Amino acid sequence: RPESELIRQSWRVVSRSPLEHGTVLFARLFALEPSLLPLFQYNGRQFSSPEDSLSSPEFLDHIRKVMLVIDAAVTNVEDLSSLEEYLTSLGRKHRAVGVRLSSFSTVGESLLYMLEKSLGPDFTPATRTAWSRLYGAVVQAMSRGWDG
Numbered sequence: 766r767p768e769s770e771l772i773r774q775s776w777r778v779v780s781r782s783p784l785e786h787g788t789v790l791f792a793r794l795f796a797l798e799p800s801l802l803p804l805f806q807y808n809g810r811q812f813s814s815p816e817d818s819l820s821s822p823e824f825l826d827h828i829r830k831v832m833l834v835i836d837a838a839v840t841n842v843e844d845l846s847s848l849e850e851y852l853t854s855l856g857r858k859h860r861a862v863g864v865r866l867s868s869f870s871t872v873g874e875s876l877l878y879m880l881e882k883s884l885g886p887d888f889t890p891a892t893r894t895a896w897s898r899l900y901g902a903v904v905q906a907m908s909r910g911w912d913g
């Protein structure tokens with residue numbers, strides 16, 4: 766595949782520091798959709814502001830979890846079938862915690878934003894398209910968890 770290599774090569778730099786890069790993605794997410802902030806309840810409390818979430822070890826742990834799932838999508842970029850079941854159940858979990866399926870589009874824009882900022886001139890239109898397709902397929906798999 767051509768695009769599989771585009772994903773592999775562009776993930777290499779980001780994957781060296783997943784928490785740093787993940788923090789960009791979530792900062793961008795709350796700037797676009799602040800109504801997602803209350804969905805992260807740790808120790809029975811709601812974060813008041815987006816900067817509150819960045820001081821929470823549990824929230825930062827979830828950033829690393831998100832990045833590891835994306836790492837698994839890249840590893841299986843040539844055949845995402847083998848992750849379908851895991852992704853479906855991850856969708857069910859997120860539905861249970863209160864995330865609306867449509868919020869995953871904003872997550873996609875946040876991921877693309879983070880890649881654009883990290884890669885700079887190396888974020889070619891083919892690289893955007895490749896990532897849009899891969900994230901699209903991840904979300905399709907996850908969408909099964911919302912009653913099908």
Ligand code: HEM
Pocket residue numbers: 801804805806823827830831832834835855858859862864868869872
């Ligand atoms: C809309 C943005 C998202 C919100 C509000 C959200 C929120 C949550 C919450 C509340 C949990 C349960 C508490 C925890 O363990 O932290 C969770 C778990 C988790 N999240 Fe997310 N999440 C989002 C996006 C994602 C995405 C896009 C991925 C995939 C790349 C992901 C990967 C994971 C994983 C692997 C877990 C552990 C699941 C388990 O207990 O089985 N998260 N998330």
Ligand SMILES: [Kr]
Pocket residue numbers: 788791792793795815816818819
């Ligand atoms: Kr954040």
Ligand SMILES: [Kr]
Pocket residue numbers: 835838899900903
């Ligand atoms: Kr992805």
